[PDB]
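Co-fold these.
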Amino acid sequence: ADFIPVKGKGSRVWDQQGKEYIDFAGGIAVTALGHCHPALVEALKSQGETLWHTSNVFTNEPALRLGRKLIDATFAERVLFMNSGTEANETAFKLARHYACVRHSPFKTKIIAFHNAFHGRSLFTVSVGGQPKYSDGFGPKPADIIHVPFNDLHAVKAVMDDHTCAVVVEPIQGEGGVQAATPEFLKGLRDLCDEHQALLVFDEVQCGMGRTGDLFAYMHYGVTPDILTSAKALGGGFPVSAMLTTQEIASAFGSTYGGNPLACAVAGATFDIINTPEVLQGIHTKRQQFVQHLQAIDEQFDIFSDIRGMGLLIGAELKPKYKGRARDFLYAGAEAGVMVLNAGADVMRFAPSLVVEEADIHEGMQRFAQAVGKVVAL
Amino acid sequence: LPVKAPADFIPVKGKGSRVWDQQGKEYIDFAGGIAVTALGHCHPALVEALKSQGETLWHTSNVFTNEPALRLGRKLIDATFAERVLFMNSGTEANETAFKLARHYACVRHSPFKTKIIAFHNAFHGRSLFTVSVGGQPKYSDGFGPKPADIIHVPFNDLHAVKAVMDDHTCAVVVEPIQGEGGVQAATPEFLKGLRDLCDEHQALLVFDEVQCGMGRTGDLFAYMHYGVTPDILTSAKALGGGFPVSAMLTTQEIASAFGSTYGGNPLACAVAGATFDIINTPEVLQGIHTKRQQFVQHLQAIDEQFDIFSDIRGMGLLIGAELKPKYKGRARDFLYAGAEAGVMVLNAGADVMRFAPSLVVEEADIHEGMQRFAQAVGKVVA
Ligand SMILES: Cc1ncc(COP(=O)(O)O)c(/C=N/OCC[C@H](N)C(=O)O)c1O
Ligand SMILES: Cc1ncc(COP(=O)(O)O)c(/C=N/OCC[C@H](N)C(=O)O)c1O
Ligand SMILES: O=[N+]([O-])c1cc([N+](=O)[O-])c(O)c([N+](=O)[O-])c1
Ligand code: NA
Ligand code: NA
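Predicted complex below.
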């Protein structure tokens, strides 16, 4: 990036020179309520005057309240809080392994994961991730992880057995080209996990906390996982994460564990806004506003082969002529004053605030059209 | 057995080195949330930094830098051997980055086969699968399926053992200059210098985990400065953010080039850490840490004179360990819980060792009051 953001309000961001940008990136789907949302600032300041920190020896009122919100709203009966999606995934993957070890057999260790998956950058999580380029070169990887293609239920059936402890999947692969699970695939994972006494682990770090227009993507699909991870949007920009599971599974390790008081106070305020009928409905309204602009851009410039994703996770795949050039459009966008994402070198990605104003959708998309125009003019 | 608070002990408010629970019971905090709140609770400078940056910008992705991250990177670079800084959230993440970097540096500069990591019994480096496997407590790394391989453990402070296992296939030695969880055991000068010399000989990287002993804890900004032994990579967290989760991996340009001068860092986190750094890295605060250590130690000695409970008082700066006599082997949790009943929050470092990690600016009045409360608790335990 060739600029330094210094200030943000809602979906507008200013750099050191006072240039104004429309933010359709959200810090990679993190600032789900935009920058410096008044309710989140209020929660930060109030808890900031009270108590910031407890060790995991203790609980605290913000953690208890956030845990109760998540438990009441989801399949979860137990919640463990951490800082990042990577830590939440470490916890989920360790827990699925440990549960298999103590409830079934120490030899029940296979983890099935998917090509193009992203689960974090720790050694274990990057090894469960499905991009060999990112996991190569750090010495011996944690073993017993098998990768098959996303959306290939037959391949999962083929590799799964009584020695399998988990299937780990992103219901929508965000980094991996914004690819959504098909209904049959996701239901199939649930059935195969039931058959083999393995745990189904949904990584909802990117697609959770309202991103799809349901509180969690699993709710859209109607497929209940055993363990779910959440981060990013959960804290609206404050680092916080959660691992959600049942009492039966968590017992392999009170309804909550961990949680920074400050982080959890902010996440509570974020949860209270995102988990409302009006905000969730609005995510679908706004998706259509974005998609209509992307279609208009494609009609004018002929650059997209597909527009996909769910809610306000949007992917627009570039036509073969522009394969490999997502970064060129990202940089042209920045020049035109709009912040966008890629999802690999072939895919444009958008992950704006879930409450992005219509006026900002229109302005940012006009700027993006200008960017596309400048690139295609060459 | 872990230490866990019961349902009737939920902290709700902190100010300085005092904490109140839901019932309004007041505690003196000599634990700092396990050496995290190095400037105590709701320190006004940290609150101000939190609030001002909180009105401005909280978050950038790692695609961008931000002014708080740049300022904090510069402060750390100017104050230490570092030329490059990577910011993360937790000590576990910083250690993941450090260990991956040492592995990757060896892979690309020497050989993909140069993978051995040497670490120490009783080490604690975090709870991710890789960090807990580098950690030196098998009980905590057992039971998660196949561990990342090529990690060798030898006894802390045993230089012969390190020499024995190291070779040209070794990429790193990972060490806490003081093992905090492992009984508050400090490296001897010979041992730490020996690690540096062995790493130089074998072209391996010396990695200091200063998550607990760094950011002023020892009375120097980092423990490596006390020892005068410069690592290749250093990790910091806990005190760095004073209660806000933030961490850092510090290294040189030569090493980092295997992966400007700063990468990552949450704007809000880095604003708070900048304010924390500005206070801790002062001659007066650093001197005060030594004064305050001796105030604690004199109290512990007075307790021992009265009750005969300790075989050793150790640590550095305001990381203090007090080892229980054999008569009280395995009683550390009981003294901790008795302390809480008496209104003082303390730590353990294994079942045989009391640990103290108070605010680096803990007021003398709080030292005296909390230690009087601790004496009362001891009296109840040994009656
Ligand atoms: C599905 C999914 N699972 C886990 C993670 C890791 O979460 P994090 O540690 O909170 O960044 C992520 C994080 N994505 O972050 C953006 C890419 C990333 N910035 C990187 O390469 O580190 C994710 O998308
Ligand atoms: C030398 C050393 N290295 C790494 C870490 C991990 O740092 P963290 O991820 O910031 O907690 C620590 C953290 N210790 O904290 C205590 C334990 C904590 N509740 C846990 O079990 O993770 C440490 O002392
Ligand atoms: O080791 N343990 O199984 C264990 C269990 C509980 N508990 O509430 O059921 C504790 O509070 C603690 N504890 O106090 O650390 C330990
Ligand atoms: Na529930
Ligand atoms: Na330097």
